[PDB]
Amino acid sequence: RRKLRPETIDIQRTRDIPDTHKAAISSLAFHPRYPILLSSSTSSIMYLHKLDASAYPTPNPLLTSVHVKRTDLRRAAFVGPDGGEIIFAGRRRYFHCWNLSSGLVKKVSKIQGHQKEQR
């Protein structure tokens, strides 16, 4: 990719994400290592897609599709430079941390004396 000049950009629309959400998209995030897009909506669903415009039979194929029970997803983010854990949260008073190796999801629900401050 070239170094870009300050008046016009060579932007170029590629094959859009095939799976749509049933509500507004609250957060997008890219994996810091691999070309993997994580989308999260208010309809309690996170989608992980692999960026492959030249894929078959569907461009940008889906890796996994995680539904979180009863939590709308207001924000989801990758953790660290390696992109090892996904921390995701919504209106509720808890947030989950999902490790992408070994697959365990821990639900943090106490902020150690400041649980009154965090509604």
């Binding site: 509500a23 029970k69 009863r70 709308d72």
Partner: peptide
């Protein structure tokens, strides 16, 4: 008051999805 997606429609989309986190 009116939520964006109600909990029953969240349940239906969770039936449609792949991996459910309780």
């Amino acid at each position: 008051k009116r939520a964006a997606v109600s909990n029953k429609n969240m349940d239906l989309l969770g039936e449609s999805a792949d991996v459910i986190i309780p």
